[PDB]
Design a protein around this ligand. Sequence first.
Ligand SMILES: NC(=O)c1ccc[n+]([C@@H]2O[C@H](COP(=O)([O-])OP(=O)(O)OC[C@H]3O[C@@H](n4cnc5c(N)ncnc54)[C@H](O)[C@@H]3O)[C@@H](O)[C@H]2O)c1
Ligand SMILES: NC(=O)c1ccc[n+]([C@@H]2O[C@H](COP(=O)([O-])OP(=O)(O)OC[C@H]3O[C@@H](n4cnc5c(N)ncnc54)[C@H](O)[C@@H]3O)[C@@H](O)[C@H]2O)c1
Ligand SMILES: NC(=O)c1ccc[n+]([C@@H]2O[C@H](COP(=O)([O-])OP(=O)(O)OC[C@H]3O[C@@H](n4cnc5c(N)ncnc54)[C@H](O)[C@@H]3O)[C@@H](O)[C@H]2O)c1
Ligand SMILES: NC(=O)c1ccc[n+]([C@@H]2O[C@H](COP(=O)([O-])OP(=O)(O)OC[C@H]3O[C@@H](n4cnc5c(N)ncnc54)[C@H](O)[C@@H]3O)[C@@H](O)[C@H]2O)c1
Lengths: 272, 272, 272, 272, 78, 78, 78, 78
Amino acid sequence: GFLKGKKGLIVGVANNKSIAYGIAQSCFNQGATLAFTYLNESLEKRVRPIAQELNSPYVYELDVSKEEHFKPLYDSVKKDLGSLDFIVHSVAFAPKEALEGSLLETSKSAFNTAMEISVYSLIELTNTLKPLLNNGASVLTLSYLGSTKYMAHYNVMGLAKAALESAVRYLAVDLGKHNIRVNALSAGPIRTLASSGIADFRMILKWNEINAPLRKNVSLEEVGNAGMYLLSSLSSGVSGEVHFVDAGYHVMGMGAVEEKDNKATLLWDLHK
Amino acid sequence: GFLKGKKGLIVGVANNKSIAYGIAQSCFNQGATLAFTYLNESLEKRVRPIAQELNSPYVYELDVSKEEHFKPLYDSVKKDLGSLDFIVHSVAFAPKEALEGSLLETSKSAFNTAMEISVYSLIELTNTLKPLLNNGASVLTLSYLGSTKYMAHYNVMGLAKAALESAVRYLAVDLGKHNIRVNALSAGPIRTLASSGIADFRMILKWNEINAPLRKNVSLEEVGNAGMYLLSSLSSGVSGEVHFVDAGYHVMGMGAVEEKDNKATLLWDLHK
Amino acid sequence: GFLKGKKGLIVGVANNKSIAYGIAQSCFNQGATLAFTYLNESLEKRVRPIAQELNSPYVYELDVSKEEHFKPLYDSVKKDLGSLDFIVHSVAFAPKEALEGSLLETSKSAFNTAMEISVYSLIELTNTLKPLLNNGASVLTLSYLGSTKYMAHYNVMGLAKAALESAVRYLAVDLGKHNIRVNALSAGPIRTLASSGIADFRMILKWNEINAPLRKNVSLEEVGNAGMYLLSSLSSGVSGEVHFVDAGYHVMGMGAVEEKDNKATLLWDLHK
Amino acid sequence: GFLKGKKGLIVGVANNKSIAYGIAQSCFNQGATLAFTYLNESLEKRVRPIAQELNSPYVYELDVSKEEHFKPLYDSVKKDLGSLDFIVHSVAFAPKEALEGSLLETSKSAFNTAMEISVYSLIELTNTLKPLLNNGASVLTLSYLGSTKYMAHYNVMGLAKAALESAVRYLAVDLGKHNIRVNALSAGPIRTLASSGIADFRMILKWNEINAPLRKNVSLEEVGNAGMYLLSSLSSGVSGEVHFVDAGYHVMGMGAVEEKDNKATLLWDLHK
Amino acid sequence: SSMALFEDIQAVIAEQLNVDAAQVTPEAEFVKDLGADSLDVVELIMALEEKFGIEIPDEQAEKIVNVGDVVKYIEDNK
Amino acid sequence: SSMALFEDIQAVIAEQLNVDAAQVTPEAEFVKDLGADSLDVVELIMALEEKFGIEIPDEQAEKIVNVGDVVKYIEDNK
Amino acid sequence: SSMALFEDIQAVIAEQLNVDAAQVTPEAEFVKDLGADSLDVVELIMALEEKFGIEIPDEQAEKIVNVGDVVKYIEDNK
Amino acid sequence: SSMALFEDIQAVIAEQLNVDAAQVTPEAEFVKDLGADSLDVVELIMALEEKFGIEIPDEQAEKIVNVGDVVKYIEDNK
Ligand SMILES: NC(=O)c1ccc[n+]([C@@H]2O[C@H](COP(=O)([O-])OP(=O)(O)OC[C@H]3O[C@@H](n4cnc5c(N)ncnc54)[C@H](O)[C@@H]3O)[C@@H](O)[C@H]2O)c1
Ligand SMILES: NC(=O)c1ccc[n+]([C@@H]2O[C@H](COP(=O)([O-])OP(=O)(O)OC[C@H]3O[C@@H](n4cnc5c(N)ncnc54)[C@H](O)[C@@H]3O)[C@@H](O)[C@H]2O)c1
Ligand SMILES: NC(=O)c1ccc[n+]([C@@H]2O[C@H](COP(=O)([O-])OP(=O)(O)OC[C@H]3O[C@@H](n4cnc5c(N)ncnc54)[C@H](O)[C@@H]3O)[C@@H](O)[C@H]2O)c1
Ligand SMILES: NC(=O)c1ccc[n+]([C@@H]2O[C@H](COP(=O)([O-])OP(=O)(O)OC[C@H]3O[C@@H](n4cnc5c(N)ncnc54)[C@H](O)[C@@H]3O)[C@@H](O)[C@H]2O)c1
């Protein structure tokens, strides 16, 4: 098992549809000792049973907007685990109003919330836990094509993911001299609990399914296996990377076509 | 003159070494009616004479962290100019401590300052002035290779520029349907007043000069001409673009070499 | 006029819809002394009158597959012009069969033709004319988004443009130490004589018009002005760059949307 | 074992330092049934023993410049294996003279050799073997950062790798509708038998080691594990991807620095 | 409401909010009477549309408040 | 063929190939009788579809050989 | 201090801060006695190093407070 | 040549080209007398420089032709 005996902290499980869960589950099947965090008591109800299922008693409170939660999280990990081999940062947030309409409409406070919660928390979490990381440790965050290309209504969250991918590059430099790796997994759209906060996610999901090279949406298992890879020693030469797990969708410069011997037609134009 | 009769608001002049000044000066030589803003009274002392020199009585107060400055700026432009054909957003800031050492060290408040001042102000400025933009208007911001590649000590400002380039893409979509363009000019390092806030800027400037394809640093005139181009109707098919004006430096995946018939040698290794 | 007194060789005019013509025309309006080449006698009929119109007696034969044409072209330029300040390489070709269907179907001979004609000719043309280039000379080639993203049926010509953009980077390094610049202009789809060789170009042109930020196809004038810029001293800090002149289309990661207060809808889904 | 029962054809083993060998070895440790090809009899001497070691009797002749070798290779695979789940295309070549000096010097025949051997052979190999691919098959080729950034003396091979990465995108589209994946692994420099054909490879290897985030060159095992991942069902949501396995080197926009409390210094400037 | 439809929707709501079927009555409301946060509801909505192959649009999703709403909606669209 | 249509198409073909209108007869063929290469034809086709707002598809474009073809085609699709 | 050096540095400081040379004395300090903000100083520093081809490092730059400091520094490094 | 050095280099060449040590004499040449292609040699060179921590530069690498060359070279640079 490629993570046998390796300790990892999973941040961001909301339910068994969370990207964080897929990753945690794939790492479990590879023999990882997991620990989990939860936003508040409403989320502890959901994390702590799932943690149980992945054979884990280590369940800690972390609201990344509460500076005061981080020292306790450090102490908990040192008490119960002593060291970490990987960290999964699977967390983002923006107010509903910002994930719709235009970027021009965005409030300064919505901006600051999207940036603090979705980007700065990787800095504070990695800085907090840096003293406990073992040789070869691997830090993983989650991004989206909306960072470097326009995606409908993704707006301020595209700005956050662009910064997030840039943070991955700088953190990879900062931490690489201590032989620690930092990567982003850029998932394709996948029906999750936070992804329902995106206006007409469903249409983005369809557009992806029709137009991706593999003519499928990605499965939660596919994101988890890719994540597991990046967390595992299999990827010990990979750092600073933005790894697309999106059924190939990133390569498309235009809608997919299909030919009827006559014209070419957009695939999109066949179903309706 | 390619901007004869065209009205433009220059945001960010600090002295005659400011990138904003080079741009403003190039636009002047192309016949533009300019207006300028200043951070505070300390900066009004420097803007208002330079504005004079570029034949401009329109000098307004804009501290982009003061929400209350934007409605007055709107009113001033409507009174004195009535409409705008272009806007130059040449503004960024981060506390000294963040532009040195690691990204891991960065404070949440330094983060929020870098993001608000350097990225969100493009949203608030363009949203504020959007009702006054003419057909074909052109909005220009200023970025740096540190956005998508690691540059020494650029740290949180790399995160800001990544978001900034992503904002350019979304704003280009938002505004393009009203036939308004939005671009970033990604300048090479250039000795300016804010660029002295970067730890060992001088060495970054040297590394660029030695290793750029053209073996020179860029001149203030070169950034201004590139900017003028992007502001002018010459570039009316260009939007969402990040335009490198850096003596070609972005193409280098490694230090430049030069051969002595024997080995190859890094150019860097010749002068010392 | 930004190219007054500057000598330039335009390679690739086919008629007054050729990208090369737009560029040549924009440079003319900036005061350039032009010279032109033609593929064969069938094309001399069309070049030599257009050259006349742009005030040029210098019209030379160049089939880039004929190694033996290049020494004569050198001699002609030295006789009639003595030196060059810029070169426009606006030339590509692939057999019909390769610009349709799949890449898998491509013949080795179609591959070799696409690569020789569309990429290697930039090397042989720039190497041939390198001794005649003045200080600050500027070499421009023409590319397409199909190089780094999938575009329908673009197939082997995407492979050629990827190489072509890579050649621009290496040539920019090779030539930059002699203070010579090399760039690519990446045009959006535009109805030209060679572009009719692309299967269902018309649909690619429509998809671009609907989905580009500026909701327009680019005009021949817009490509020419962008080209002129890159050829002129205005861009003397720009080298190794791939400059998109495509109405902003490159930023789109998906079809454009528009909201009816209810759902979001693809713009494409409104007209049919 | 993640490739238990899965059949794969390894193209490009030269000795036990070949990238192809690392990949083949990693796939072996995951339970793959391998088959191998060799350039000629000089190379059969080296492939066939290594194949033996990886438990394989299937060793076939393939010189990718011999069109006539491909039908026999098809027949051999159908006879002995019946189907394929993955293909490793680990093959490139250019004459010595082209991997040194400038791109401008390159001969048309060197160009054609680099393109045919290094790029077109992926088309002919995948087209030939396409009828034998199973559901979920995975096609892997090998690239280098020299494709999209300038690397010293990489010259025509940068052009080839740019095309190669573009071919990956188009092939991913072509083959994805049959649920077949196509990727490139972009390795960092690694001392191999062909890599000795690159002028001052040793200095490129050193520059990478000093300046990569992880301050190490990549190991043959690290490339093999990354390859195995891309060949395995673990990456079944990954297609059209260029996956960097380079100790993080791709993120660097400049030489690495390190601070002595005083100045910053290039790491390169410490050892000499 | 069709009784087979209501009972089947009732089982989903029951399991989702870990309440007894008995407490799931057409008048009951997820926030007030059923103890559901913003997550419970969103999770429950997906469970329903996934179960029924239909999709509650987001605009229609907000306007739901009570068990009857989801039932009367689903019956009109299945 | 409608005479107004033919005459208007005839002027286009005339100007495009710099021949006299007199030589532009329905039987005439662009390659053989009118001295048109592969460019002349493609340029001429665009001139026609641009003029007439319609678009000759590429499949229909090949199957054209003579003045009558372009005329009979355009009349059926304008 | 060398008098030619001081006078030449004094002209720079004078012009830069638009004060009279008379007020530029070795004891004077840019913030306190010369009315210079954080920009004035940074601009003035660049003027000096550009003038003198040398470069005041940033660590040495902070430790400057008075006209004498910049003068004694420049004389030691020109 | 130092006899310990020669014998140690001789074992490398022997194993690398799968010849008997006896045939590895200072006069012998890899292409002619030892049956080595362009790969054998390049592989053998790496084996040597890796073994000896030194690096034969490519310019010096070509100029090697015989066992004596590699031996006399290595002794001068180890
Ligand atoms: N289509 C997708 O679902 C998709 C695609 C690509 C990337 N991503 C990214 O994946 C990551 C996980 O999102 P998901 O789709 O699995 O949604 P999810 O709702 O399952 O996970 C979001 C997690 O963020 C946690 N969170 C939010 N604010 C927090 C805070 N202030 N403190 C601590 N935790 C907080 C949420 O409680 C939840 O645990 C995010 O970065 C998301 O942007 C999602
Ligand atoms: N090497 C470089 O100098 C370089 C390179 C690439 C990009 N840039 C970017 O160019 C732009 C201009 O910087 P510059 O180098 O010309 O420095 P500069 O000091 O000349 O310009 C910075 C401007 O930002 C203004 N500013 C800062 N905070 C402000 C605020 N809160 N409200 C209003 N104005 C504020 C400053 O007062 C000044 O006018 C910035 O985006 C910078 O990041 C600079
Ligand atoms: N949509 C577009 O039209 C579009 C978009 C982006 C880039 N481009 C590129 O622009 C450049 C010009 O193409 P265009 O669209 O203006 O078409 P065009 O037909 O007007 O120009 C093509 C030119 O290539 C010349 N040519 C072909 N083979 C030649 C040879 N063997 N020797 C000398 N000349 C030869 C042709 O004769 C013609 O002059 C090409 O690189 C094309 O790929 C075109
Ligand atoms: N630094 C590196 O070594 C490095 C880095 C990145 C990518 N790559 C790529 O990895 C791949 C493998 O190279 P390597 O470094 O393992 O070198 P290698 O010499 O071990 O492998 C090269 C293989 O190509 C085979 N080959 C050459 N011409 C052939 C032909 N005409 N027909 C069939 N086979 C032929 C060679 O015989 C050999 O088997 C190539 O694409 C190379 O460009 C290498």
